């Protein structure tokens, strides 16, 4: 609605401090601002955004914002060059997608090793001595095993990588979920559960209740969890993650960002809120007092927060890890690794079979979500030499082991296809996108009577 601001923030982040900023914003301008924290908002936001009854400002890590920008759900920002100097250029690079600068960077988040001084005096420097430490404590460590963000630093410790980054450009064809280091890293996590050092059904909520009650010696969490552990009065410490095979753990670096809905008529009010009220020491100190943000992007406030040992330990783990890509293909990568880690913890599939499926699903399967009623442009890149002289096709796979029904084929209703044979780019145009059009399509190259898969495409349709 015109004249109002709706903000969505994560249930694990501090919305009480942000609500205090809303009272200061409402006091000076007279605009009521409502902060909400719906569950699974990272999946719920795109469904409701384009409709109109969506939030004006969304808070989430920067890896999800690239799929939003490609779908046209977020407006380009023009923070006056003077204002950009207030934030660190490193944080601005995280929120840059095709030069758009879609979102405002707020805070930098990174996992840390949190251990209780009651249960453990000196934390282990290596992963390998945790099984022996758990035998003496019998627990040694409890952390979320349902989200791959928490278990990735062990997988990435031995050289595992998501998408190769060569000269500022990510190579979507070089995915490393089944490399030599990931197989050794994931096996260690499974062996911890097989040896009854961890449980396969442990989630985030269990770890918060267990560690804050002095039941486990260590946990793995971000800065947002410090406020609830301080309330438990347990003397906890924040330190560097243990090394694996002599190599440091590489946690994925997250940048808390605020995006403005493209359909919201309150962009100016939101921009005036984000620039003049959110990104100040006054606004962030109120939010930081609710739930810690970590390493903030504002230089003036970061100079004070960095003196805190909890924030300094977060930077130590952040410097050992790499920043998350903001490309749209990251969403399919996270779900594939999430499903693979869960199967290995339960023992239903081996580590080799779990990572083999996750690598395949993460390779050339970019999820596309377009707004209903508008056009959706998919670009299937392919080798122009290997497939030279071959016609292309665009078909819908009906089953997991079923046939692919040829919607259109190159040299149909609301689907048009064009082939750039010189540049190696196949483009399919969907006009007036509607529901039921979602259905895991495939880009194919025809030779004789056989067809090779160029890139499986998972289309999703927003409610609009």
């Amino acid at each position, epitope marked *: 609605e015109e004249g109002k601001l709706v903000i969505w923030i994560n249930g694990d982040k501090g919305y009480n401090g942000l609500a205090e900023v809303g009272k200061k914003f409402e006091k000076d301008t007279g605009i009521k601002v409502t902060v909400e924290h719906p569950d*699974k908002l990272e*999946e719920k936001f795109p469904q409701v955004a384009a409709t109109g009854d969506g939030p004006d400002i969304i808070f989430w890590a920067h890896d999800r914002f690239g799929g939003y920008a490609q779908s046209g759900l977020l407006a380009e920002i023009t923070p006056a060059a003077a204002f950009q100097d207030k934030l660190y250029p490193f944080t601005w690079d995280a929120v840059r997608y095709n030069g758009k600068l879609i979102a405002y960077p707020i805070a930098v988040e990174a996992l840390s090793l949190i251990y209780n001084k009651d249960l453990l005096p000196n934390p282990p420097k290596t992963w390998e001595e945790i099984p022996a430490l758990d035998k003496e404590l019998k627990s040694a460590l409890m952390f979320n095993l349902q989200e791959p963000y928490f278990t990735w630093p062990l997988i990435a410790a031995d050289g595992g990588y998501a998408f190769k980054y060569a000269a500022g450009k990510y190579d979507i064809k070089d995915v490393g979920v089944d490399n030599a280091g990931a197989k050794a890293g994931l096996t260690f996590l499974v062996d911890l559960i097989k040896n009854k050092h961890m449980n396969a059904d442990t989630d985030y909520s269990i770890a918060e209740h267990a560690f804050n009650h002095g039941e486990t010696a260590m946990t793995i969490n971000g800065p947002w969890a410090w406020s609830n552990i301080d309330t438990s009065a347990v003397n906890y410490g924040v330190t560097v993650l243990p090394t694996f095979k002599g190599q440091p753990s590489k946690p994925f670096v997250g940048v808390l960002s605020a995006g403005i809905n493209a359909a919201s008529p309150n962009k100016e009010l939101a921009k005036e809120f984000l620039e003049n009220y959110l990104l100040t020491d006054e606004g962030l100190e109120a939010v930081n007092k609710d739930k810690p943000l970590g390493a903030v992007a504002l230089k003036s406030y970061e100079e004070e927060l960095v003196k805190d040992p909890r924030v300094a330990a977060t930077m130590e783990n952040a410097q050992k890890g790499e920043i998350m890509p903001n490309i749209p293909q990251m969403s399919a990568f996270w*779900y594939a690794v999430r*499903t693979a880690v869960i*199967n290995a913890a339960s023992g*239903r*599939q081996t580590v080799d079979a779990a990572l083999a499926a996750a690598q395949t699903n993460a390779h050339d399967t970019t999820v596309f979500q377009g707004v209903a009623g508008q056009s959706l442009q998919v670009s299937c890149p392919y080798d122009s030499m290997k497939h030279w002289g071959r016609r292309k096709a665009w078909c819908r*796979q*009906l*089953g*997991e082991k079923g046939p692919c029904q040829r919607v259109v084929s190159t040299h149909n209703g609301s689907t048009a296809i064009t082939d750039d044979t010189l540049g190696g780019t196949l483009t399919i145009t969907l006009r007036n996108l509607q*529901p*039921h*059009d*979602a*259905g*895991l399509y495939q880009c194919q190259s025809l030779h004789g009577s056989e067809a090779d898969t160029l890139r499986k495409v*998972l289309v999703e*349709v927003l409610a609009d």
Partner: antibody, heavy 123, light 108 residues
Framework: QVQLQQWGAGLLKPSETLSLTCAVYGVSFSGYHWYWIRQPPGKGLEWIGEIDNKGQTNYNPSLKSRVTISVDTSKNQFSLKLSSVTAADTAVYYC?????????????????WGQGTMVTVSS | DIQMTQSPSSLSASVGDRVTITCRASQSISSYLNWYQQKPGKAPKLLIYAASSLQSGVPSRFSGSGSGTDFTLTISSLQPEDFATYYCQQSYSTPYTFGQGTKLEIKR
């Protein structure tokens, strides 16, 4: 070419936990919606919960405090669990699949149904 | 949760009659209402999806109409096997609630 067959405890006592399993033959759980729907004797249908093609679970808010739906892909079975069963839970329970294959959830209306299992809860 | 209201609760008609059954939603569900036919002792069978698209194999005498809040299922020429209880289902909401149902009987 694809059918669902159900089995489980048909007789329960109050305060116990209901456990029903529904076996799927011919297709994996990926790509479709999978529903649990119950029908009390002489009453209409009641939606218990669903799972999405991505494994996301959604429950009826009136039953969210007592429902747990899980899937075992190794046996291609998916189960319905009722924590604090009460006499009001006497019903025929149906498992059903949505027929989109990675389509939109609007058209994922249950088109393939199991035979259902009569569950009677009484002291 | 969206409330679904069917009318009439029970209806009797002869073979060949043209029958209409109404389903009203408590709020706008766009055009995503589904119709089912349930005979005694059997599992429900999907007839209409997305308000007007008939599932493959259902007789052409079944037809659906409506949008937003008011929807209608129509049997153009009633047949002896069509007599059963019919249910409407919305697919717009997060919980997928059903209507009270409409018992179809034979006049005598």
């Amino acid at each position: 070419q694809v059918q669902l067959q159900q089995w489980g405890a048909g007789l329960l006592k109050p305060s116990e936990t209901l456990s029903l399993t529904c076996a799927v033959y011919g297709v994996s759980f990926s790509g479709y919606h999978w529903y649990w729907i119950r029908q009390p004797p002489g009453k209409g249908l009641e939606w218990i919960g669903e799972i999405d093609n991505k494994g996301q679970t959604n429950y009826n808010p009136s039953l969210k405090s007592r429902v747990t739906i899980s899937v075992d892909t190794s046996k291609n079975q998916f189960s319905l669990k009722l924590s604090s069963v009460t006499a009001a839970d006497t019903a025929v329970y149906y498992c059903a699949r949505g027929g989109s294959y990675y389509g939109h959830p609007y058209l994922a209306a249950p088109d393939i149904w199991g035979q259902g299992t009569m569950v009677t809860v009484s002291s | 949760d969206i409330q679904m209201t069917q009318s009439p609760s029970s209806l009797s008609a002869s073979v060949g009659d043209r029958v209409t059954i109404t389903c009203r939603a408590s709020q706008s569900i766009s055009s995503y209402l589904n119709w089912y036919q349930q005979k005694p002792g059997k599992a429900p069978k999907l007839l209409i999806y997305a308000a007007s698209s008939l599932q493959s194999g259902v007789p052409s005498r079944f037809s659906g109409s409506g949008s937003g809040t008011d929807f209608t299922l129509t049997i153009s020429s009633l047949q002896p096997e069509d007599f059963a209880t019919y249910y409407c289902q919305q697919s717009y909401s997060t919980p997928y609630t059903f209507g009270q149902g409409t018992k179809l009987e034979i006049k005598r």
